[PDB]
Amino acid sequence: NKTVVVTTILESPYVMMKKNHEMLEGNERYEGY
């Protein structure tokens, strides 16, 4: 088993930067549908 690399785009409200994305790393930087 390996970590699956997911390509995505920053498009609201599918993928957005969390308010404190700069205090967050990896997947935690992003939020959205």
Curated annotation (Swiss-Prot):
Q: Which family does it belong to?
A: Belongs to the glutamate-gated ion channel (TC 1.A.10.1) family. GRIA2 subfamily.
**In the UniProt entry for this protein, what further remark is given in the free-text comments?**
The postsynaptic actions of L-glutamate are mediated by a variety of receptors that are named according to their selective agonists. This receptor binds AMPA (quisqualate) > L-glutamate > kainate.
What is the role of this chain? Answer: Ionotropic glutamate receptor that functions as a ligand-gated cation channel, gated by L-glutamate and glutamatergic agonists such as alpha-amino-3-hydroxy-5-methyl-4-isoxazolepropionic acid (AMPA), quisqualic acid, and kainic acid. L-glutamate acts as an excitatory neurotransmitter at many synapses in the central nervous system and plays an important role in fast excitatory synaptic transmission.
Induction context = Down-regulated in the pyramidal cell layer of CA1 in the hippocampus by global ischemia.
Q: How does it assemble?
A: Homotetramer or heterotetramer of pore-forming glutamate receptor subunits. Tetramers may be formed by the dimerization of dimers. May interact with MPP4. Forms a ternary complex with GRIP1 and CSPG4. Interacts with ATAD1 in an ATP-dependent manner. ATAD1-catalyzed ATP hydrolysis disrupts binding to ATAD1 and to GRIP1 and leads to AMPAR complex disassembly. Interacts with GRIP2. Interacts with GRIP1. Interacts with NSF via its C-terminus. Interacts with CACNG2, PICK1 and GRIP2. Interacts with GRIA1 and SYNDIG1. Part of a complex containing GRIA2, NSF and NAPA and/or NAPB.
Please report the name of this protein according to its UniProt entry. Answer: Glutamate receptor 2
- Please give the record's comment on domains: The M4 transmembrane segment mediates tetramerization and is required for cell surface expression.
Query: How this protein is processed and modified after translation, per its record?
Result: Palmitoylated. Depalmitoylated upon L-glutamate stimulation.
Q: In which tissues is it expressed?
A: Detected in forebrain. Detected in dendrites of neuronal cells. Expressed in the pyramidal cell layers of CA1 and CA3 and in the granule cell layer of the dentate gyrus.
**Which branch of life, at top level?**
Eukaryota
| Positions spanned in the full protein | 413 to 445 of 883
Where in the cell? Cell membrane; Postsynaptic cell membrane; Postsynaptic density membrane
Glycosylated where? 1
